Amino acid sequence: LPVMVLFRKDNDEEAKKVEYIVRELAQEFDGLIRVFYVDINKAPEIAKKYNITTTPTVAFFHNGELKSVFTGAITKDQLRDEILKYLG
């Protein structure tokens, strides 16, 4: 399954909308993708590995490889279109 990972900071107002969007897509594509939520402060080594410095950031992985990274202003349509790409 393709994987979508939300990198988040705890007290972040814009991160709230992206977290809603990601959870919405997680349900919409349940069973077809896996979604993980990484707290930058609780897991700094993962954020460091993936060069995550701003939050919210959403990354996509497939076949154990990093495929794309979205930062800054993030929309549901952007994320959904990536999900569809890796589903075929």
Author numbering: 18 to 105
The authors write:
As a proof of concept, we enhanced the stability of a marginally stable designed protein (called dF106) through conventional directed evolution. dF106 was created in an effort to computationally redesign the ubiquitous Rossmann fold of thioredoxins using Rosetta Design. Using the CPOP system, dF106 variants were selected, genetically resulting in a protein variant dF106-L11P-D83V, henceforth termed enhanced dF106 (edF106). Crystal structures of stabilized variants showed small perturbations in helices 1 and 2, which rendered them closer in structure to the redesign template.
We therefore introduced the 15 substitutions predicted to be most stabilizing by the GMMA into the isolated edF106 protein to measure their individual as well as combined effects on thermodynamic stability. All the same, the MM9 variant had a stability of −68.6 ± 1.1 kJ/mol (ΔΔG = −21.8 ± 1.1 kJ/mol, n = 5) and an extrapolated melting temperature of 152°C ± 10°C (n = 5). To gain more insight into the effects of the mutations, we crystalized and determined the crystal structure of MM9 using diffraction data that extended to a resolution at 1.9 Å. However, there was no visible electron density to fit the N-proximal residues (1–17). The crystals grew very slowly, typically within a month, with a low success rate out of 48 examined crystallization conditions. Only one or two would yield crystals indicative of a conformational change taking place in order to stabilize the crystal lattice.
